[PDB]
Amino acid sequence: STGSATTTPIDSLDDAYITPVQIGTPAQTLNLDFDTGSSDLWVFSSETTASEVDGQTIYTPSKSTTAKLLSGATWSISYGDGSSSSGDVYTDTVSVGGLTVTGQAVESAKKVSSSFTEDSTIDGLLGLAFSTLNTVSPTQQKTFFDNAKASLDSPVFTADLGYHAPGTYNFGFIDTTAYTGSITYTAVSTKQGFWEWTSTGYAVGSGTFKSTSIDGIADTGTTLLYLPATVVSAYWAQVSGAKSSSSVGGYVFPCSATLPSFTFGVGSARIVIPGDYIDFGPISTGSSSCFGGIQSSAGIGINIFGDVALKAAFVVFNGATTPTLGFASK
Numbered sequence: 001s002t003g004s005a006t007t008t009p010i011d012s013l014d015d016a017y018i019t020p021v022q023i024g025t026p027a028q029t030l031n032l033d034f035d036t037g038s039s040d041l042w043v044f045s046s047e048t049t050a051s052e053v054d055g056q057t058i059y060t061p062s063k064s065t066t067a068k069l070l071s072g073a074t075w076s077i078s079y080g081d082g083s084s085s086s087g088d089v090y091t092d093t094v095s096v097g098g099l100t101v102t103g104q105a106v107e108s109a110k111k112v113s114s115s116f117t118e119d120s121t122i123d124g125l126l127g128l129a130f131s132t133l134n135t136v137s138p139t140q141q142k143t144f145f146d147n148a149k150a151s152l153d154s155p156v157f158t159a160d161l162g163y164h165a166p167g168t169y170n171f172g173f174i175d176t177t178a179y180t181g182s183i184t185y186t187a188v189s190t191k192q193g194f195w196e197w198t199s200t201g202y203a204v205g206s207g208t209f210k211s212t213s214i215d216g217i218a219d220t221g222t223t224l225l226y227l228p229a230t231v232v233s234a235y236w237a238q239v240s241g242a243k244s245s246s247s248v249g250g251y252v253f254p255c256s257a258t259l260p261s262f263t264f265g266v267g268s269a270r271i272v273i274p275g276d277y278i279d280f281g282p283i284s285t286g287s288s289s290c291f292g293g294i295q296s297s298a299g300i301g302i303n304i305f306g307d308v309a310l311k312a313a314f315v316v317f318n319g320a321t322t323p324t325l326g327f328a329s330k
């Protein structure tokens with residue numbers, strides 16, 4: 001089997017991408033944030049505290065003839081920004097772009113933190129990291145991809161995120177028309193439950209390439225590119241007026257600037273992020289100070305190849321017995 005679904009930016013900055021997902025019978029379509037950095041499929045629901053729902057589409061398990069309570073199961077998750085959600089668990093039929101998993105764990109939120117409530121466009125998350133990170137207790141549950149994998153034509157999914165435009169998540173096949181050149185595959189460590197890999201280095205703008213190992217994760221659920229402070233300083237040093245602001249929370253730069261590109265290495269191959277992809281616009285409405293799309297990972301503990309990096313590439317998440325990641329230009 002295969003599936004293919006369009007993913008759409010939630011706003012003009014590409015802060016996140018939402019993909020329609022069919023849950024239950026008859027189908028209830030929710031727009032979920034596909035997150036290769038986590039492993040829970042959770043949704044706003046008829047059980048979510050009413051004051052914490054503000055425009056989201058909710059899953060109502062009582063209206064699904066295929067929903068079954070996973071008795072005694074609870075879940076609770078916290079993300080990198082301090083946001084959080086928790087609740088109980090149903091199993092139900094979940095379909096993405098024509099690919100169907102029966103008995104998928106659908107984690108129904110009883111509580112969500114304010115950042116989720118405030119984002120009316122995200123109805124939940126669909127985790128695509130390794131199932132070892134799934135938070136369901138006392139019986140850990142598998143991701144949608146893990147459940148679908150054996151049925152797929154090839155045990156892979158691909159992320160082709162757009163720049164200020166829709167893109168595509170495919171399951172079970174590689175669309176050879178969606179990228180230029182060849183896909184370079186690179187080794188993955190699953191030891192922390194992520195799609196963790198080692199970039200071979202970087203370049204800023206038209207500069208030469210700096211060969212250096214950068215261990216990080218391919219994370220569709222993170223907006224920006226988080227890299228070591230040395231690398232990030234070398235980038236922003238090329239932008240007149242750019243500086244790190246503790247009050248704003250990262251590197252800012254004059255909105256009047258044109259930004260240099262940023263290249264990262266995948267083996268001997270190179271992915272070039274255009275400068276415009278690094279512009280996240282005014283720090284607040286009407287400001288002439290703009291927020292940068294490349295930020296330091298120093299406080300995080302891990303480097304994160306988030307959407308800023310991934311949207312410059314066609315990315316293969318290969319879930320074969322030995323997982324690998326593939327990157328191609330596009």
Ligand SMILES: C#CCN(C)Cc1nc([C@]2(O)CN[C@@H](c3nc(-c4ccc(C(F)(F)F)cc4[N+](=O)[O-])no3)C2)cs1
Pocket residue numbers: 033035036037038078079080081082083114115116117119122125219220221222299300301
């Ligand atoms: C600090 C530290 C060290 N560690 C914990 C960093 C890590 N972080 C992760 C992830 O959880 C995996 N992918 C990312 C993700 N982020 C969101 C998301 C969605 C919606 C919202 C909204 F509420 F604003 F709508 C906010 C977020 N958000 O910023 O968390 N979804 O997925 C982050 C793995 S390791």
